[PDB]
Design a protein around this motif. Structure first.
Motif, PDB file in Angstrom:
ATOM      1  N   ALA A 286      61.226  21.631   7.495  1.00 11.72           N
ATOM      2  CA  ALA A 286      60.168  20.655   7.260  1.00 11.72           C
ATOM      3  C   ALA A 286      60.344  19.940   5.924  1.00 11.72           C
ATOM      4  O   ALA A 286      60.327  20.574   4.870  1.00 11.72           O
ATOM      5  N   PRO A 287      60.517  18.610   5.972  1.00 11.91           N
ATOM      6  CA  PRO A 287      60.646  17.765   4.780  1.00 11.91           C
ATOM      7  C   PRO A 287      59.492  17.954   3.797  1.00 11.91           C
ATOM      8  O   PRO A 287      58.341  18.094   4.209  1.00 11.91           O
ATOM      9  N   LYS A 288      59.812  17.962   2.508  1.00 13.46           N
ATOM     10  CA  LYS A 288      58.813  18.159   1.463  1.00 13.46           C
ATOM     11  C   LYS A 288      58.096  16.859   1.122  1.00 13.46           C
ATOM     12  O   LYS A 288      58.604  15.773   1.399  1.00 13.46           O
ATOM     13  N   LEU A 289      56.918  16.978   0.513  1.00 10.13           N
ATOM     14  CA  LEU A 289      56.090  15.817   0.193  1.00 10.13           C
ATOM     15  C   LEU A 289      56.820  14.820  -0.706  1.00 10.13           C
ATOM     16  O   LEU A 289      56.649  13.609  -0.562  1.00 10.13           O
ATOM     17  N   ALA A 290      57.636  15.328  -1.624  1.00 13.81           N
ATOM     18  CA  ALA A 290      58.422  14.466  -2.502  1.00 13.81           C
ATOM     19  C   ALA A 290      59.434  13.654  -1.698  1.00 13.81           C
ATOM     20  O   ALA A 290      59.765  12.526  -2.060  1.00 13.81           O
ATOM     21  N   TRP A 291      59.917  14.233  -0.602  1.00 11.88           N
ATOM     22  CA  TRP A 291      60.904  13.572   0.248  1.00 11.88           C
ATOM     23  C   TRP A 291      60.295  12.373   0.974  1.00 11.88           C
ATOM     24  O   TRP A 291      60.886  11.294   1.014  1.00 11.88           O
ATOM     25  N   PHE A 292      59.110  12.570   1.545  1.00 13.27           N
ATOM     26  CA  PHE A 292      58.400  11.493   2.230  1.00 13.27           C
ATOM     27  C   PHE A 292      58.053  10.352   1.281  1.00 13.27           C
ATOM     28  O   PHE A 292      58.020   9.190   1.683  1.00 13.27           O
ATOM     29  N   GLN A 293      57.794  10.689   0.022  1.00 12.04           N
ATOM     30  CA  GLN A 293      57.291   9.709  -0.934  1.00 12.04           C
ATOM     31  C   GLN A 293      58.379   8.811  -1.511  1.00 12.04           C
ATOM     32  O   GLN A 293      58.077   7.752  -2.060  1.00 12.04           O
ATOM     33  N   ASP A 294      59.639   9.216  -1.382  1.00 15.90           N
ATOM     34  CA  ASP A 294      60.748   8.381  -1.840  1.00 15.90           C
ATOM     35  C   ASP A 294      60.783   7.067  -1.063  1.00 15.90           C
ATOM     36  O   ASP A 294      61.611   6.884  -0.170  1.00 15.90           O
ATOM     37  N   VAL A 295      59.879   6.159  -1.419  1.00 14.53           N
ATOM     38  CA  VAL A 295      59.718   4.900  -0.703  1.00 14.53           C
ATOM     39  C   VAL A 295      60.801   3.884  -1.060  1.00 14.53           C
ATOM     40  O   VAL A 295      61.204   3.083  -0.216  1.00 14.53           O
TER      41      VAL A 295
ATOM     42  N   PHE B 191      44.894  14.289  11.896  1.00 15.04           N
ATOM     43  CA  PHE B 191      45.590  15.301  11.099  1.00 15.04           C
ATOM     44  C   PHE B 191      44.951  15.561   9.738  1.00 15.04           C
ATOM     45  O   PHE B 191      44.836  16.713   9.313  1.00 15.04           O
ATOM     46  N   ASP B 192      44.542  14.498   9.050  1.00 13.42           N
ATOM     47  CA  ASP B 192      43.916  14.650   7.739  1.00 13.42           C
ATOM     48  C   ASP B 192      42.519  15.247   7.859  1.00 13.42           C
ATOM     49  O   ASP B 192      41.908  15.628   6.858  1.00 13.42           O
ATOM     50  N   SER B 193      42.018  15.329   9.087  1.00 12.63           N
ATOM     51  CA  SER B 193      40.765  16.019   9.364  1.00 12.63           C
ATOM     52  C   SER B 193      41.008  17.507   9.603  1.00 12.63           C
ATOM     53  O   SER B 193      40.086  18.316   9.509  1.00 12.63           O
ATOM     54  N   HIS B 194      42.250  17.863   9.916  1.00 14.34           N
ATOM     55  CA  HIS B 194      42.601  19.257  10.159  1.00 14.34           C
ATOM     56  C   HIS B 194      42.768  20.009   8.846  1.00 14.34           C
ATOM     57  O   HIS B 194      42.101  21.015   8.608  1.00 14.34           O
ATOM     58  N   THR B 195      43.671  19.523   8.001  1.00 17.57           N
ATOM     59  CA  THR B 195      43.876  20.097   6.674  1.00 17.57           C
ATOM     60  C   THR B 195      43.725  19.013   5.616  1.00 17.57           C
ATOM     61  O   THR B 195      43.578  17.833   5.940  1.00 17.57           O
ATOM     62  N   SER B 196      43.765  19.414   4.353  1.00 18.07           N
ATOM     63  CA  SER B 196      43.644  18.472   3.247  1.00 18.07           C
ATOM     64  C   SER B 196      44.944  18.386   2.455  1.00 18.07           C
ATOM     65  O   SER B 196      45.095  17.520   1.597  1.00 18.07           O
ATOM     66  N   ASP B 197      45.879  19.284   2.751  1.00 20.82           N
ATOM     67  CA  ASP B 197      47.197  19.246   2.127  1.00 20.82           C
ATOM     68  C   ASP B 197      47.977  18.040   2.637  1.00 20.82           C
ATOM     69  O   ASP B 197      48.111  17.844   3.842  1.00 20.82           O
ATOM     70  N   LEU B 198      48.486  17.235   1.712  1.00 24.42           N
ATOM     71  CA  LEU B 198      49.186  16.009   2.074  1.00 24.42           C
ATOM     72  C   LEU B 198      50.557  16.310   2.674  1.00 24.42           C
ATOM     73  O   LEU B 198      51.047  15.567   3.524  1.00 24.42           O
ATOM     74  N   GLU B 199      51.165  17.407   2.229  1.00 22.89           N
ATOM     75  CA  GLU B 199      52.477  17.814   2.724  1.00 22.89           C
ATOM     76  C   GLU B 199      52.421  18.180   4.204  1.00 22.89           C
ATOM     77  O   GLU B 199      53.300  17.800   4.977  1.00 22.89           O
ATOM     78  N   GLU B 200      51.380  18.912   4.596  1.00 25.48           N
ATOM     79  CA  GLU B 200      51.224  19.342   5.982  1.00 25.48           C
ATOM     80  C   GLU B 200      50.950  18.164   6.909  1.00 25.48           C
ATOM     81  O   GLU B 200      51.508  18.090   8.002  1.00 25.48           O
ATOM     82  N   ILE B 201      50.087  17.252   6.471  1.00 26.39           N
ATOM     83  CA  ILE B 201      49.770  16.061   7.252  1.00 26.39           C
ATOM     84  C   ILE B 201      51.020  15.215   7.472  1.00 26.39           C
ATOM     85  O   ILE B 201      51.267  14.728   8.576  1.00 26.39           O
ATOM     86  N   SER B 202      51.811  15.056   6.414  1.00 25.91           N
ATOM     87  CA  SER B 202      53.034  14.263   6.478  1.00 25.91           C
ATOM     88  C   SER B 202      54.046  14.860   7.456  1.00 25.91           C
ATOM     89  O   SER B 202      54.758  14.131   8.149  1.00 25.91           O
ATOM     90  N   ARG B 203      54.103  16.187   7.507  1.00 25.64           N
ATOM     91  CA  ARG B 203      55.021  16.881   8.402  1.00 25.64           C
ATOM     92  C   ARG B 203      54.573  16.780   9.855  1.00 25.64           C
ATOM     93  O   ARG B 203      55.399  16.764  10.768  1.00 25.64           O
TER      94      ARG B 203
END
Ligand code: CHL
Ligand code: CLA
Ligand code: CLA
Ligand code: CLA
Ligand code: CLA
Ligand code: CLA
Ligand code: CLA
Ligand code: CLA
Ligand code: CLA
Ligand SMILES: CCCCCCCCCCCCCCCC(=O)OC[C@H](COP(=O)(O)OC[C@@H](O)CO)OC(=O)CCCCCCCCCCCCCCC
Lengths: 215, 41, 742, 207
Positions: free
Chosen positions: C174-183, C48-60
């Motif tokens: 689709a969950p936002k990047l800030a949402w995934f990061q709430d560790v 996935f990280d080879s497809h795009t470079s946006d972290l939000e898209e990869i996370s989704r």
């Protein structure tokens, strides 16, 4: 400038029964999509409340009446007891229990579905498809209050800005019924017996009654 | 959907083809089992 | 800051992209010119990280992918329960578990396969299963095929919900990047919500369904007569006659003063002499502690109320004289890189699977699991491989992080630094330890072989000659024996029967478990384990530490994570890449795990499993020859492989002939792998040149120009078949052996 | 001849663009977008027409159990179990004969679908001809003697809509009967009566 508990930015007080309370921040509108949108919830509390508002009465009315009213075999069993099969075992009825539900889902299917259309479209429902009441349909600008007439035959404060001083009333009572019913779920669940019947024991004597006591 | 038809006829075309072949072969065997020779001539 | 639910509205849903192969990559979406295109399409499908470079898209992408995974697992579970309902002898097995073979797969009568439907008992013809599902179901109090059928539907429904959720969280909300990061949030929930409520939930079904029903089964009452689980909840009388503590409600719990609940919960420990499984009264109690523990643990991290912990705070405050400002910046790295997280998780989940295997054999949890040797050998071996693979995968993603996400200028760490600043010291030492372990484990064997062959048994490393008694493990073993009453007064019996000393448990005529002896034979194999593990660690750690740079290749990081080499220069630089280190490490994991599961299989049959009669006389399967013949390589070749392989090579005509077929079948693909591993694509491509000529001659040359496999793929193909062949051989060998003999 | 203010299956919704309203029986119903493309749609329309027509003949099958139940007749054999009978020459032979005639019938309609013409002739007498324009409306004396088929749009549409609507209804009907027998192992009409006697307890649930 109004009584309020807890902290959030968007609880303007522009919504009826707003005490500005959302510790979980469910209504925060930052990220919206799905069923987490704030307006939906506003509509939902009211629907859930109206239904709950209504149900609480059903739960106890038959209970209460057979007690000081003319009800025989149809003597209200616990509210819980007629519908769910295991405790009361239910009661026969003019129709089969499963079948009623199908019919019941069938009737609701029409009213409920249309209501949604009101939410997805303003006057769509009230527009087209033959039969009277379609005019009845589409009423209002707001889905929450279709402004029946129909739904409201009597203006009943609809015209007066006082309708606000009704909205809240409707809203507060709604939370109240809601709360109540949840009680039954437990009361009936541990207490067995009926919510009303349950009420008496606390009533016959109170020290003896209650949860600690119940245990 | 044109496009759905397009997903198909990919290597899903192979499996649909071989599944049909497998079925045919299986039925033949069920009908004519243990054949070591062609005996009709 | 304040943590909340963040999403975005619809982001497309069409079959348009289904019709376009390799759409995810800009290079490969143009279509094929050579056959290499096809392989690349499947190899970069999940990158996935080879497809795009946006972290939000990869996370989704990875979030919905997990829904897809769960959907399959639920569909997979739906089938096992279904097959236990339509095509199984579970109800038959439920009456006589000690004699009837568990089976859950019937074969169609085509082409002669019906022979595989052997005599599994209970007037049933089918394939003996070693999954262990029968002992799970009996433990859950599952009586009828109806209940297995209902669970089948329940799992299938859940499978639909999981699959629907994935679409909903990629295409709808689709969950936002800030949402995934709430560790701090996520850990709180997975600690308390998933694990705490999860363990709490199962503690409930046990003390209402499992414990009541299991007692009936053990009393000897007919399963069809036993009241349904819901008759225990409604009428508390039934659950009062047995386990009379239920007479009261929430008391004593609510009034504390714990407990009269010792009745259905205890710290008894050991093993049930009638079922051979861990006391259900202990397991239910066990899940009670686990629930509360995880519920407590779920309130460490600070969220939206100022009480708790900032993980970023904790890390930064952990710095020493030896380490610098280390730990600082780790939070930003672990919240920014998926590969970094996956590496840690694989390493730990993989390590967990390995301790699961060692814990489930020595502390048999389900009833009638211990004396079913067919299952126990399968469960232990299965988890060893699963854990083994996941660990190698940690190395791959650790390496990928170094190549792809590592940036000193943006997200420095200091702890990761310094390590790179003496990577030669770490690898050179790990190199030495391996050589020391090789000589001092394997070399002892070769010594033993030579002395035996020269007729000098007294010059061997054995219990009867030069002894290497593993006293440290023995002392511990003895300590756990004297543990109950002395150290742990609450514990009635020992933790495991391997520590019992003078206690034995039998079900039917077969031995469930007993104290496992440790001698010079066990000493040698463990150092072999210590040896093989280190070498695997060496290959993988070398790959990670030198992934970016090297005295040979200063700019290896520019070549990527997966590249064949950097040419024949500098003497030759084949397999310098981190990928090729994972590739090399795969063989060594295989080497290590294989000698581990052989260590298990021989030790159990020789010293543990076997027949016991009512005179006390114990007769083990291989008759205790482990001590005197596992200390020699010829012994392993003869008394283990040659002797025990007789079942699988004598299985033709029997119900176990499929194992005979898979035995040879796996030898085939293993040797097949060697064609790819010993050769290079240079030859093959030239060979294809002559073959392409022939097709052009007959006007039947394809537009998609045929090409030999890439250098890396040739290695990927080779190690894949080497693993499939080798592992499947032992599989067929194990199952045939343990089903026939056991 | 599109109508966009036509009633829809879903009153609130929006119909797909391909479902123009020009076609007869168009209530804007293609959630799966099966009729998503014109080429597929023409085919589907013809298919529906045939299913509908065949289903309607099948509905008669429902009709016979009525007379047999009360009026009587030689139609007493239930449609279910009707096939395994000994009349005439054996079924298999019958089927083979049927395959040939009907084959010629379509190896017949099919040419028409693919093309616009072939109606243009009676092969034996190239003059009988016959013509109706439009797709699954061959026309002519054989198929449209009364000639009510030829007419005007609005009228044709109305009539045609009637054809399709009955068909859709017929289709559910036939399927309902087949399932009805298996779940109940009886006659459909019996099911019908039984239901009326006790609609309250006589349903799928009753069993
Ligand atoms: C065209 C539609 C058509 C339909 C819907 C049916 C449907 C049926 N046929 Mg027919 N048939 C049809 C055409 C024809 N059938 C037959 C000849 C038969 C025979 C010989 C039999 C059937 C039978 C059956 C039944 C099998 C039940 C089943 O599968 O249970 C799961 C089923 C109701 C079987 C039966 O006994 O049904 C009652 C049977 O034996 N059909 C012929 C050849 C003349 C047909 C020609 O067009
Ligand atoms: C479905 C029932 C329901 C729903 C949808 C709402 C929805 C709402 N409430 Mg209300 N409330 C309810 C029941 C409900 N309430 C009851 C029964 C009471 C009395 C205890 C209250 C007392 C109350 C106050 C004082 C306030 C609100 C407010 C609000 C608004 C902001 C909070 C929010 O969005 O969270 C959305 C809620 C949900 C999505 C439901 C989640 C509930 C889960 C399942 C927990 C259930 C636990 C329970 C033990 C079982 C929102 C419109 C605030 C407002 O501004 O009014 C407009 C305001 O401050 N509520
Ligand atoms: C052809 C397939 C089809 C399908 C799947 C539907 C499905 C539906 N229709 Mg539609 N309808 C159809 C054809 C169809 N219709 C046709 C051909 C017409 C003539 C124009 C209509 C006219 C129509 C009207 C006027 C309404 C619907 C409504 C509905 C919805 C309500 C059903 C319900 O709740 O009770 C379930 C039914 C049981 C028997 C149970 C449901 C989505 C209603 C709606 O939109 O929500 C209230 C509505 O009022 N339909
Ligand atoms: C679902 C289970 C199932 C069942 C009960 C059947 C049953 C049957 N199949 Mg089918 N089949 C199946 C699945 C099934 N099949 C699957 C999954 C495939 C692959 C898609 C096939 C492909 C298949 C083929 C190619 C044929 C059958 C045929 C037959 C019939 C044998 C006819 C005969 O008289 O023998 C004797 C025939 C002689 C000529 C002597 C029999 C009714 C045969 C048939 O009836 O043709 C239509 C036939 O040749 N089957
Ligand atoms: C406390 C509530 C809770 C629970 C029970 C879970 C459970 C799970 N999470 Mg979630 N998570 C949570 C809160 C929770 N999470 C919150 C608040 C966040 C935001 C920080 C996340 C962010 C998150 C991510 C990014 C991911 C997960 C994933 C997972 C799954 C891990 C795989 C597994 O165990 O399969 C076991 C399956 C089950 C136990 C079935 C449970 C199904 C639902 C939750 C039942 C709840 C019903 C309830 C009574 C009403 C698991 C289902 C991973 C996943 O696999 O995605 C799909 C994943 O990648 N979680
Ligand atoms: C997994 C979570 C879980 C759930 C959903 C339940 C649910 C229930 N429990 Mg159980 N319980 C649990 C865990 C759980 N329990 C654990 C872990 C223990 C051991 C500490 C108990 C010990 C327990 C006792 C002694 C009793 C219940 C009872 C009940 C029922 C309540 C009836 C009542 O009001 O009491 C009045 C209810 C179905 C009562 C019951 O069986 O119903 C009559 C009851 O007597 N529970
Ligand atoms: C949590 C588990 C997990 C996850 C999510 C990933 C995810 C990923 N991996 Mg990692 N990996 C893992 C575990 C995991 N891996 C383990 C345990 C190992 C040790 C073997 C590895 C070793 C590894 C390497 C060496 C590489 C990756 C790579 C990748 C990335 C792309 C891979 C891809 O496109 O799929 C494609 C899937 C296939 C081509 C399927 C091939 C089929 C396999 C090889 C055989 C299956 C046979 C089957 C088991 C039985 C035979 C049946 C047969 C007869 C039909 C992706 C991020 C690649 C990367 O570059 O990262 C960015 C990369 O080169 N992984
Ligand atoms: C059976 C074949 C075989 C053998 C014996 C070895 C042996 C070894 N491997 Mg190799 N490996 C193999 C197959 C083998 N491998 C295959 C097929 C692959 C492909 C995946 C690899 C991939 C691989 C990698 C990537 C690495 C190794 C490493 C090592 C060394 C580990 C350290 C050690 O044990 O030192 C001790 C040496 C032995 C135990 C050999 C036996 C010594 C005998 C018994 C004693 C000496 C005999 C006698 C006294 C000598 C004098 C005789 C005189 C007449 C000359 C060791 C030399 C690692 C390494 O380099 O070490 C740090 C390393 O990283 N291997
Ligand atoms: C010479 C080989 C040959 C073959 C294989 C066919 C085959 C066919 N013809 Mg043709 N035909 C032929 C020669 C042939 N014809 C010649 C020389 C003439 C004179 C010019 C015709 C004139 C003719 C006419 C007028 C028609 C056909 C039709 C047909 C189709 C009828 C299908 C059927 O019989 O029902 C099924 C039979 C089963 C056994 C099943 C069939 C594809 C009919 C058609 O329209 O097909 C598309 C049709 O109307 N044919
Ligand atoms: C049982 C398996 C272990 C076998 C023991 C021998 C293997 C030793 C392998 C590593 C040795 C290198 C240690 C230097 C690495 C080093 O300098 O670590 C740094 C550490 C000093 O700690 P600090 O003051 O830096 O702590 C602060 C931060 O590191 C934590 O935030 O020293 C130790 O770890 C002592 C324990 C060593 C024993 C570990 C076992």
């Amino acid at each position: 400038w109004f009584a309020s508990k807890q902290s959030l930015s968007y609880l303007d007080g522009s919504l009826p029964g707003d005490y500005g309370f959302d510790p979980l921040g469910l209504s925060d509108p930052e990220g919206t999509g799905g069923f987490i949108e704030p307006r939906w919830l506003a509509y939902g509390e009211v629907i859930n409340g109206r239904f709950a508002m209504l149900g609480a009465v059903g739960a106890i009315a038959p209970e209460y009446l057979g007690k000081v009213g003319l009800i025989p075999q149809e003597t209200a069993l616990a509210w819980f007891q007629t519908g769910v099969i295991p405790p009361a075992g239910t009661y026969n009825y003019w129709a089969d229990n499963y079948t009623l539900f199908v019919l019941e889902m069938a009737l609701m299917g029409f009213a409920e579905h249309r209501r949604f259309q009101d939410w997805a479209k303003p006057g769509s429902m009230g527009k087209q498809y033959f039969l009277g009441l379609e005019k009845g349909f589409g009423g209002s600008g707001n889905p929450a209050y279709p402004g029946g007439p129909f739904f409201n035959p009597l203006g009943f404060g609809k015209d007066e800005k006082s309708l606000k001083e009704l909205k809240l009333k409707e809203v507060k009572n709604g939370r109240l019924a809601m709360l109540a019913i949840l009680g039954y779920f437990i009361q009936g669940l541990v207490t067995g017996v009926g919510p009303y019947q349950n009420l008496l024991d606390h009533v016959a004597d109170p020290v003896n009654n209650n949860v600690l006591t119940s245990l | 959907r044109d496009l759905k038809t397009y997903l198909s006829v990919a290597p899903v075309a192979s499996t649909l083809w071989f599944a049909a072949l497998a079925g045919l072969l299986i039925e033949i065997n069920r009908l004519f089992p243990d054949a070591l020779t062609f005996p009709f001539f | 800051e304040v943590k909340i639910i963040l999403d975005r509205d619809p982001i497309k849903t069409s079959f348009e992209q289904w019709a376009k192969p390799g759409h995810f990559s800009r290079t490969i979406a143009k279509g094929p010119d050579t056959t290499t295109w096809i392989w690349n399409l499947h190899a970069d499908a999940h990158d996935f990280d080879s497809h795009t470079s946006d972290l939000e898209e990869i996370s989704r992408k990875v979030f919905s992918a997990h829904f897809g995974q769960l959907s399959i697992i639920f569909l997979w579970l739906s089938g096992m329960y279904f097959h236990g309902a339509r095509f199984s002898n579970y109800e038959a097995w439920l009456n006589d578990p000690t004699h009837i073979r568990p089976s859950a797969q019937v074969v169609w009568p085509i082409v002669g396969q019906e022979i595989l439907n052997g005599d599994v008992g209970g007037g049933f013809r089918g394939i003996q299963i070693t999954s262990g599902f029968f002992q799970i179901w009996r433990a859950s109090g599952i009586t009828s095929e109806l209940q297995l059928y209902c669970t089948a539907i329940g799992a299938l429904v859940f499978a639909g919900l999981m699959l629907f959720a994935g679409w909903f969280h990629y295409h709808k909300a689709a969950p936002k990047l800030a949402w995934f990061q709430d560790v701090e949030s996520m850990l709180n929930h997975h600690l308390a919500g998933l694990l705490g409520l999860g363990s709490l939930s199962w503690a409930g079904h046990q003390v209402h369904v499992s414990l009541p029903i299991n007692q009936f089964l053990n009393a000897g009452v007919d399963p069809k007569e036993i009241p349904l689980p819901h008759e225990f909840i409604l009428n508390r009388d039934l659950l009062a006659q047995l386990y009379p503590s239920f007479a009261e409600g929430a008391t004593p719990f609510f009034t504390l003063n714990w407990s009269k609940y010792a009745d259905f919960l205890t710290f008894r420990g050991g093993l049930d002499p009638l079922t051979g499984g861990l006391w259900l009264t202990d397991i239910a109690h066990h899940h009670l502690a686990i629930a509360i523990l995880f519920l407590i643990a779920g309130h460490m991290y600070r969220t939206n109320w100022g009480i708790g912990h900032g993980i970023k705070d904790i890390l930064e405050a952990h710095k020493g004289p030896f380490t610098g400002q280390g730990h600082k910046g780790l939070y930003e790295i672990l919240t920014t890189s998926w590969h970094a997280q996956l590496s840690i998780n694989l390493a730990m989940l993989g390590s967990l699977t390995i301790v699961v295997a060692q814990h489930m054999y020595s502390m048999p949890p389900y009833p009638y699991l211990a004396t079913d040797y067919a299952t126990q050998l399968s469960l232990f071996t299965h988890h060893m491989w699963i854990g083994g693979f996941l660990i190698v995968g940690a190395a791959a993603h650790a390496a990928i992080f170094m190549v792809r996400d590592y940036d000193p200028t943006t997200r420095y760490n200091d702890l990761l630094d310094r390590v790179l600043r003496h990577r030669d010291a770490i690898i050179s030492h790990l190199n030495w330890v391996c050589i020391f372990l090789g000589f001092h484990s394997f070399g002892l064997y070769i010594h033993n072989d030579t002395m035996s062959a020269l007729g000098r048994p007294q010059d061997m490393f054995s219990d009867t000659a030069i002894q290497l008694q593993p006293v440290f493990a023995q002392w511990i073993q003895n300590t756990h024996a004297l543990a109950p009453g002395t150290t742990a007064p609450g514990a009635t019996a020992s933790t495991s029967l391997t520590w019992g000393g003078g206690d034995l448990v039998a079900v039917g005529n077969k031995v469930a478990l007993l104290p496992i002896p440790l001698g010079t034979a066990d000493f040698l194999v463990h150092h072999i384990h210590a040896f093989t593990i280190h070498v695997t660690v060496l290959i993988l750690l070398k790959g990670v530490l030198f992934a970016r740079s090297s005295r040979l290749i200063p700019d290896k990081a520019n070549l990527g994570f997966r590249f064949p080499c950097d040419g024949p220069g500098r003497g030759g630089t084949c397999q310098v890449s981190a990928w090729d280190h994972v590739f090399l490490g795969l063989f060594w994991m295989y080497n290590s795990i294989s000698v581990v599961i052989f260590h298990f299989s021989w030790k159990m049959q020789s010293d543990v499993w076997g027949t016991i009669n009512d005179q006390g006389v114990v007769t083990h399967i291989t008759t205790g020859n482990f001590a005197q013949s596992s200390i020699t390589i010829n012994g392993w070749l003869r008394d283990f492989l040659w002797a025990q392989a007789s079942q699988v090579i004598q299985s033709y005509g029997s119900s176990l002939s499929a194992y005979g077929l898979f035995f040879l079948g796996a030898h085939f693909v293993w040797a097949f792998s060697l064609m790819f591993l010993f050769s290079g694509r240079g030859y093959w491509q030239e060979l294809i040149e002559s073959i392409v000529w022939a097709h052009n001659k007959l006007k039947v040359a394809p537009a998609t120009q045929p090409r030999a496999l890439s250098i890396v793929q040739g290695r990927a193909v080779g190690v894949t078949h080497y693993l499939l062949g080798g592992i499947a051989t032992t599989w067929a060998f194990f199952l045939a052996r343990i089903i026939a003999v056991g | 001849v599109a109508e966009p203010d036509r009633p829809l299956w879903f009153p609130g919704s929006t119909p797909p663009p391909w479902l123009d309203g020009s076609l007869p029986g168009d209530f804007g119903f293609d959630p799966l977008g099966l009729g998503s493309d014109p080429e597929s749609l023409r085919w589907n329309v013809q298919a529906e027409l045939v299913h509908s027509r065949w289903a309607m003949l099948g509905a008669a099958g429902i009709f016979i159990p009525e007379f047999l139940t009360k009026l009587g007749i030689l139609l007493t054999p239930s449609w279910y179990t009707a096939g395994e009978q000994e009349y005439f020459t054996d079924t298999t032979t019958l089927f083979i004969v049927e395959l040939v005639f009907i084959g010629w019938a379509e190896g017949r309609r099919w040419a028409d679908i693919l093309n616009p013409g072939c109606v243009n002739t009676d092969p034996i007498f190239p003059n009988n001809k016959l013509t109706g324009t439009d797709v699954g409306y061959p026309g002519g004396l054989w198929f449209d003697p009364l000639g009510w088929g030829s007419a005007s749009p609005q009228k044709l549409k109305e009539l045609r809509t009637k054809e399709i609507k009955n068909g859709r209804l017929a289709m559910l009907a036939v399927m309902g009967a087949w399932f009805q027998h298996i779940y109940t192992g009886t006659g459909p009409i019996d099911n019908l009566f039984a239901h009326l006697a006790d609609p309250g307890h006589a349903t799928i649930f009753a069993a």
